[PDB]
Amino acid sequence: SNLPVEPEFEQAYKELASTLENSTLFQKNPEYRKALAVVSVPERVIQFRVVWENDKGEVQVNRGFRVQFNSALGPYKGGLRFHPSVNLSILKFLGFEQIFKNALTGLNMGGGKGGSDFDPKGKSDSEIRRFCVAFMTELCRHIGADTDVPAGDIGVTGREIGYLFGQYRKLRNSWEGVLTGKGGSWGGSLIRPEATGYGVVYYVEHMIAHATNGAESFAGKRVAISGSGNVAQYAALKVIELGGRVVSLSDSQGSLIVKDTAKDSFTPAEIDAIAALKVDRKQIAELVTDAAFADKFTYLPGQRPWVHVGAVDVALPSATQNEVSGEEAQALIAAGCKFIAEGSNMGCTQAAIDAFEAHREANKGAAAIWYAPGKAANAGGVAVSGLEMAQNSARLSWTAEEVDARLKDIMKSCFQNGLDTAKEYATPADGILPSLVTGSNIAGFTKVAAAMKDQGDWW
Amino acid sequence: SNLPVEPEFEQAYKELASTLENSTLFQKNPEYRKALAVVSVPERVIQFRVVWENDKGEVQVNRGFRVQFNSALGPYKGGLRFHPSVNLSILKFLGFEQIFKNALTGLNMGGGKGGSDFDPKGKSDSEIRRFCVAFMTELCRHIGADTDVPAGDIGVTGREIGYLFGQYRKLRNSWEGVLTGKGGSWGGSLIRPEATGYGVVYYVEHMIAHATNGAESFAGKRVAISGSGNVAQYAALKVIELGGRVVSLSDSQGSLIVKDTAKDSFTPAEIDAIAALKVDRKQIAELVTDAAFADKFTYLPGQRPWVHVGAVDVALPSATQNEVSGEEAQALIAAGCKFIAEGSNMGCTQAAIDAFEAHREANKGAAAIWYAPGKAANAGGVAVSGLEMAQNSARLSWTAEEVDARLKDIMKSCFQNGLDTAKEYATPADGILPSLVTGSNIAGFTKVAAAMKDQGDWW
Amino acid sequence: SNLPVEPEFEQAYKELASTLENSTLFQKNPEYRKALAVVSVPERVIQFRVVWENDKGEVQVNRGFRVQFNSALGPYKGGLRFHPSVNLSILKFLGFEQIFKNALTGLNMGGGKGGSDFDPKGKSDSEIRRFCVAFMTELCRHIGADTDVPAGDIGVTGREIGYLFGQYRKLRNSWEGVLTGKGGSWGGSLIRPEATGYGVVYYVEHMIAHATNGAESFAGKRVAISGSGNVAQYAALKVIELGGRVVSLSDSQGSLIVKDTAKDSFTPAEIDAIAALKVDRKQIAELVTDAAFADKFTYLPGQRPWVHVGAVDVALPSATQNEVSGEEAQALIAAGCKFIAEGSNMGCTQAAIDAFEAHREANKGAAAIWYAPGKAANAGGVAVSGLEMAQNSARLSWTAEEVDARLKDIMKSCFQNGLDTAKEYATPADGILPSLVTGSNIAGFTKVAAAMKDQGDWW
Amino acid sequence: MSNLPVEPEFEQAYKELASTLENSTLFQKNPEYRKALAVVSVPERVIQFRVVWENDKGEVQVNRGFRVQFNSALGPYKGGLRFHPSVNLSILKFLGFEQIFKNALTGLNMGGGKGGSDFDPKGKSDSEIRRFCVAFMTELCRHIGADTDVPAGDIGVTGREIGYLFGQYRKLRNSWEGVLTGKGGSWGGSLIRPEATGYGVVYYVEHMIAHATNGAESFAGKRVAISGSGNVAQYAALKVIELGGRVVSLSDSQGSLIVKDTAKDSFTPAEIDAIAALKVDRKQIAELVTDAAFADKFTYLPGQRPWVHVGAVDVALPSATQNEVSGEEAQALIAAGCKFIAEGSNMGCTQAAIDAFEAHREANKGAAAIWYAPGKAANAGGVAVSGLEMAQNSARLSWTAEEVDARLKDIMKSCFQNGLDTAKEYATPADGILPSLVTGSNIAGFTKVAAAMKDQGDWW
């Protein structure tokens, strides 16, 4: 009751813990409640003022954060977020998810996450540059290639990463794998831009395969996507590559959907145009008036994709946390949606998830809508970041195939761990699909909890 | 609106800012609103998990904090608090006060403050020792004799300081002035135990002197005190030494008042007995049944001193923040109280302070009740801590007189700065006393704001 | 022939070397030839890029430097010069001079200097803050309160030291005597602003009083000063204070001379008005169109004051290196000047020095021109600077008086040491004044040469 | 402006780069890179220091020490250490400047640096060297590291000397790490490092010869004029002989040693080993005037470079030191029918010589032309395998001799190819004319580095 209310974090915690309860995990390993208690308080958090100069010469204040939540499995590893709503509660939820997502890679990476309430919108390239310079001045001392390795998230693209790296290098006089999402000439890995959205799809391929006994694929499926950022961009491109039709994309202002969802789609070209806007930080709203887009797409301001795509098969929330409500989950089920995986960390509201797992428990095999949590599906990104670290570590640069091969292995291993661990610790009824949320949460939590015990963080 | 609500901090901020507004400060120096904005975001904050072992062998979790709020004037300097209600909001308010209190010493000390929600009650000496060992393991890396110099506060006595020092020494392989409130054989300063409560009194001597033109002193005054800790203990002992009668003391459970407040008092003996209990962490409640105390004192459970001491002249809240309500301030005025200085940081509720300054504005000269804020009156302690640092720095140990001399200088200089700066920037009406809160807040804030400008924290 | 030609350095070196040569020193200490070889190669030098941003958002490149020449007698100590003339040669003469000057103060201080070719002229206060910030981002690692302590020289005042310090604190998370010449409230020392200037005058009191057997002092003396900066200003104000008439200041654009040199003088108010223009980085030329100056003075663009004063008794070169030519020295001689001390570092050319010593060998007693080197007369600045370090390490602030007192003492012993050493090692003919420069050199030099030997820096 | 010391060797290499960038569409397409050109040519950091050390007689001795940390956008600082009485800031700036870009071309993450000292190894006993290296590293190590700056060897700094520095580094830093390259086998070195630079030159030219003749010729049958007789010169020569080429010249700082019959005759590997031995002893090549074996077969030419005394010759490999090919000398090589010339040595050809070889490439179509390849493209093999030492030390393993030779060969193919293809995009040559390797090598190295610098906020 001394503790401040952190609702975004509490959500994250309660889903995880709840899935741990509704399982025979604590019957077999009662001691794990002590591990859950310990792990939930972060190892370390750094908060810090960031003072920076806008183009008009005026002095600006913003709030730096870096949650270093658990380094049992590896160095702290996790993205950076620049968005006006950024607080502790939020970066704590991401840091917490990140712990356990990172475990499912089978690479040695701890959970962390940081960022700022700095808003990159309205801001010049120069203003963003200064801000990164001041942000990295303070963050510099708490991070490092064997300590904590940040990367991007909402608002932190490879460009911001560039400015952050350059300043890290100035300060510490060291060239090392201290950041991921880096550009190719200077310690970047091939596949990293693509890795998150690729990962999601690769994971749903396996969900579909198993759900339908190899009958169906993304081949000719209708796929609603939300957001239009690095995740959703390359999620959409892979759906197309496997013959899927991407029927929707969105931003902060609205969703943009093909008028004929039954048969029409986005194209690599159209996506590349939306990418260009989000380097310049413009909204989708700007390109709906052009000829190519006006005839083909409806643009719905203030509206999310889910309830206006009609019939649809796969759903990939890739914008932000809490962007699929229970109103909106029921609508997807009713539109015959039978696969939903989170591109975005905590994309689904509890209420939505409660409809999805209730449905899976009520309907047999392929008749079920199958939810996969973000820590299982958007793990591709962080997993390649590990490969980036390893590349830097070994002091060489691997080929795109070499990496995409390893990404495929790792997304598959992660589906198989969630699935097997769901059958083992919370066996579904006859003909019912294992809980992918529960098995992923349990598999992640167990590997962590035991490594913490071995090391002495708890007894 | 992303920002979490931190009410203990917001209070601290709003009083300070309000006093800055109700003054011609921002007319003369409008730029200072930018300094107020910058200074209010802390330079750095470290939060960290603390895992420790109780005597029964079981694993325990608690929350470590260290607010490093402003290092403009000097290294971060500020106490450590172990109390169950400890959160960020709270340690931020103390850290914020500490910035500006420290400025009024004229020694080079930044504002900081840290602690834990660790509760020392119910706890063995061994349990406290382990906890300090684990607490200092993490705090070790963020602190140092030229960086940040902690000390005590509620729950952190010289004993806890001992355990913290020993572990700092183990870890960093360094013997330095990294902590204050240290014991004599190992870098302690003479007068430090006594310095805070001594300081308060020394400050009220000057309030009384000026208020009454040197007519009155603590000589035969009735002095209600709250709390029974290191502040209130040596506050009470100095009141007696100057011929004052200490009529009240309190703890968490209740207040303990002499049955005859008009003519009776506590004694150095009786106080030394109450001290012994608070090394062992027992309550006042335990010694009311003995012969000496049963006949002499009434003990009122759950009740604060203020409204049950009858007539009374001086009030010294020395327990904790927000322990004098407006209900309770009016009661003091009505009982002819004409001096109130805060031993405890933010001891008075706004509502109380609003009655006190309203009264001073309504009634002329000595007919006024005169409030002095904690940052002006409990500065004695931190000021000697500086002397402790200097002693360590010069590598020698000064005599008790040498120190008490410097303490006297420094408490007086601080009254004179509050007074002069109140007359200058917010001149009272004719025959009305300067605001000691406003002048102390302004004098503290200005020295800081200008040092920040010079250094480039703002422009 | 691999060595780059560094004219500024090899001068400082040849005058030093020839004075040692033109003495008995090498007869009784031939091993010291080896000491000269070693000392005159700097222990460490740091060169660096300083990328910074102007007010237009435009990228700007400048060259940073730190010359860490000798640390046998203490941590490197030196000022920072921001002037377009800056190269390695200029900093290497200043850094080398500083060795031996610091040796004459009696304090423990090495010989350092640095800066950059960045020119503060043109620049906004914004642009200086920004250069300063980027400047110290690189410098920071190479310095520290026990390692190397920089300060001001030409174009680095307390304003710039402010920006520098504040960045260094932000970078090293440490508050220390890393820079001297700091503001009062953040580790500054009283009498710094005034130190170098007063010191020059104080030194020359002892020169006057010796040469004239105490008959003349600075009262009713006519004094020509060059420069209008820190050294110049406060020397002028001191000469004025001691009954003297200051007939000249100057800057980069021209001299400013009283029309009536025989009877008239500069005033405090006129000096305080120029100082205000130098604070604002303006020229003397700005004010030649005023009541305040038009009638009383005569602006002389692109000349130095020496030839245009005629009636003159003392010359205080206080601007920059080699600002007194062979021809100009003869003018001063011809015009009856008897005393000349370098306020500026290496103020006089070898041609000019030679004339002053040829004259000193040529005329008995007060009838000669006495030349004092900078390393002796301008040592008040660095001496008090070391008393600022002393105060920072004692965590305390000394009085105006206490410092001035130390200053006068230090300067008296500097004169005395120089005088006696010249008397021992290069005894002048009957009646002839001892060589203050040959003395001052052999004095500083032998202390460092011995310190080195002891320490194994040579054998 | 006019405060800066006149640094001739640094300014030379600055100009050859700047001018080659101007003579292309690089600044038409990306005009902003003029800013980067200005930012990059100022060193990031530089460290000068005294080096007090003790001679064999017990006498104190002084020398100047240098480390130039020019650019670190593409990696940590990387480049050798030079012990030569000529050494000064200027020289070491050219070397480090060259390095930024050379490293840019191996495709590995390495920034640019170099250092050394005016210490002169000639006449010093092995004991005196050991002591210097001790003093030298004592100041140096503060500023370097496996992830900070990785020195190595250049002229006057062999594996003997590397070892002294490594052992002192290990003491001082309490660390066994990949802080130096060109190390011994037992202790963190790599196979094919001794060989690397010279092999790397002859692999790069093997490609030049392939392009000019569409695979129809090789080093087979070619006469090859080589200068210097150190690490670069020795193993370049060994690889020529291996590929059926005739090495007709070697040289040193005193003189040149040429075969009497340049047409039909060549050096044997055994003779190269006998010289390589003389240089481990810091003894002059001159000493062979007195062995009948060599006197019969060779001609020593005290005070002459070999370029005008080889008769007709085909390939020229400067492998000694900078500016060792005059305007005059380069003309005579055109006259002899040399059609291939690669700098083994860093900035080995003069501006006169570069200007003559480029003007000639543009005057003559196909294999009539003489083809110049810069230092940064051809000798990149040293630092490429140097860069593989670090990759091996980081992974804590050792690689087979041919694992490294293969990795090397592939990098030189990439480097030749990068230079050719970049030159066609930005400085398209006329029809039938060979693309400018020096231009395309400089452009491609520069743009990688300057793109990285933009990305990292070094300029904007």
Ligand SMILES: NC(=O)C1=CN([C@@H]2O[C@H](COP(=O)(O)OP(=O)(O)OC[C@H]3O[C@@H](n4cnc5c(N)ncnc54)[C@H](OP(=O)(O)O)[C@@H]3O)[C@@H](O)[C@H]2O)C=CC1
């Ligand atoms: N990049 C990565 O490697 C990984 C990302 N993720 C998660 O995926 C999600 C998106 O990441 P990423 O694509 O990198 O971020 P980007 O900034 O690249 O894109 C963000 C997208 O989400 C939209 N968006 C952001 N915040 C909100 C909001 N509060 N309400 C509505 N729309 C919003 C943005 O709209 P607009 O363009 O208008 O701002 C934009 O379309 C995040 O939750 C992130 O944590 C998870 C794993 C890896």
Ligand SMILES: NC(=O)C1=CN([C@@H]2O[C@H](COP(=O)(O)OP(=O)(O)OC[C@H]3O[C@@H](n4cnc5c(N)ncnc54)[C@H](OP(=O)(O)O)[C@@H]3O)[C@@H](O)[C@H]2O)C=CC1
């Ligand atoms: N020590 C120092 O140098 C300085 C202290 N202060 C301030 O003075 C105050 C007291 O400090 P200190 O005496 O060192 O602390 P101590 O622990 O020595 O004593 C605390 C006293 O306050 C009582 N108390 C503590 N918390 C509460 C609460 N929440 N409600 C009611 N009573 C409470 C305690 O009762 P119990 O014994 O039952 O716990 C005890 O009587 C604090 O606000 C502190 O910040 C300010 C400047 C310097």
Ligand SMILES: NC(=O)C1=CN([C@@H]2O[C@H](COP(=O)(O)OP(=O)(O)OC[C@H]3O[C@@H](n4cnc5c(N)ncnc54)[C@H](OP(=O)(O)O)[C@@H]3O)[C@@H](O)[C@H]2O)C=CC1
């Ligand atoms: N400050 C100190 O503590 C000490 C200073 N000194 C020496 O005193 C001299 C000046 O220092 P300081 O007074 O702080 O300098 P300031 O920057 O305070 O002022 C320097 C003055 O000299 C003039 N000046 C500067 N450069 C030149 C030039 N290249 N040609 C002609 N005139 C010039 C300037 O003209 P303008 O204002 O137009 O630029 C300015 O008025 C230096 O030699 C310095 O080493 C020595 C010991 C201590």
Ligand SMILES: NC(=O)C1=CN([C@@H]2O[C@H](COP(=O)(O)OP(=O)(O)OC[C@H]3O[C@@H](n4cnc5c(N)ncnc54)[C@H](OP(=O)(O)O)[C@@H]3O)[C@@H](O)[C@H]2O)C=CC1
């Ligand atoms: N080490 C490597 O892997 C690399 C080397 N290089 C370049 O190769 C060249 C030599 O390297 P390396 O073989 O290691 O050096 P070595 O010292 O082993 O050999 C250098 C040769 O050059 C001669 N030489 C040295 N200085 C001069 C001079 N001033 N005038 C004429 N001849 C001279 C030497 O003659 P003497 O024996 O009489 O001194 C010696 O025969 C340099 O330009 C270097 O930059 C370039 C890239 C990588």
